[PDB]
């Protein structure tokens, strides 16, 4: 597939385990984040001693305890262990996932 | 040009007016942000009524539009925000769309 970068949020829908999630394609993030509001309560999370630094800093975010199988509509698949953060507006697909999708950025 | 998305920071070097800047390709941002530490003090700044929701800041912004030019002589205009205490300049979709950049997988 091919998606041009525009003023609109570049968006991707895929399965994480057996659930469908939609998120923002974010080459600006090293890691993937799922908003807690979207996180299935039966999926275990863990504390981390990591820091998520950007415009500000989110200390000790939770993370998926297990790796998740990500799958796209063409049945490409792989593993990611996303962070799970409250008060976020969108899920964020980070480069940890995007690199597994062999995504290129190209200008004409 | 062609750049694969990897674990390494995807990076772009270009001219803003007559100065060279290097920054992170950041499809997650609508707007472009230059770290104040890199901002030439003689380039005028203004307050904004904007709010930048992050992982929250009220940025200052370039008072004038800047000509961006890339190494292939593509060019255009952006009015970036200027924020201190940032590690990298962030090229946002305001710039990235003017460059006609595509995302593609095989």
């Amino acid at each position: 597939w091919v998606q041009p970068i525009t003023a609109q949020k570049p968006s991707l829908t895929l399965w994480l385990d057996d659930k469908m999630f939609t998120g923002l394609i974010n080459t600006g993030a090293d890691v993937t984040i799922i908003k807690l509001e979207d996180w299935p309560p039966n999926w275990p999370i863990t504390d981390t001693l990591t820091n998520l630094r950007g415009i500000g800093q989110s200390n000790n975010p939770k993370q998926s305890s297990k790796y998740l199988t990500w799958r796209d509509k063409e049945n490409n698949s792989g593993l990611i262990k996303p962070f799970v953060i409250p008060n976020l507006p969108v899920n964020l697909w980070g480069r940890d996932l995007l690199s597994q999708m062999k995504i290129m950025m190209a200008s004409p | 040009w062609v750049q694969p998305i990897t674990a390494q920071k995807p990076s772009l070097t270009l001219w803003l007016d007559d100065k060279m800047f290097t920054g992170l390709i950041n499809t997650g941002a609508d707007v472009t942000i230059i770290k104040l530490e890199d901002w030439p003090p003689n380039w005028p700044i203004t307050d904004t009524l904007t709010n930048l929701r992050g992982i929250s800041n009220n940025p200052k912004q370039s008072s004038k539009y800047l000509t961006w030019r890339d190494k292939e002589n593509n060019s255009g205009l952006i009015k970036p925000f200027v924020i201190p205490n940032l590690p990298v300049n962030l090229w946002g979709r305001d710039l990235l769309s003017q460059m006609k950049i595509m995302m593609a997988s095989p």
Binding site: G28, D30 | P87, L90
Partner: peptide, 7 residues
């Protein structure tokens, strides 16, 4: 890790 969403 670094995270840049600024809707």
């Amino acid at each position: 890790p670094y995270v840049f969403a600024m809707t």
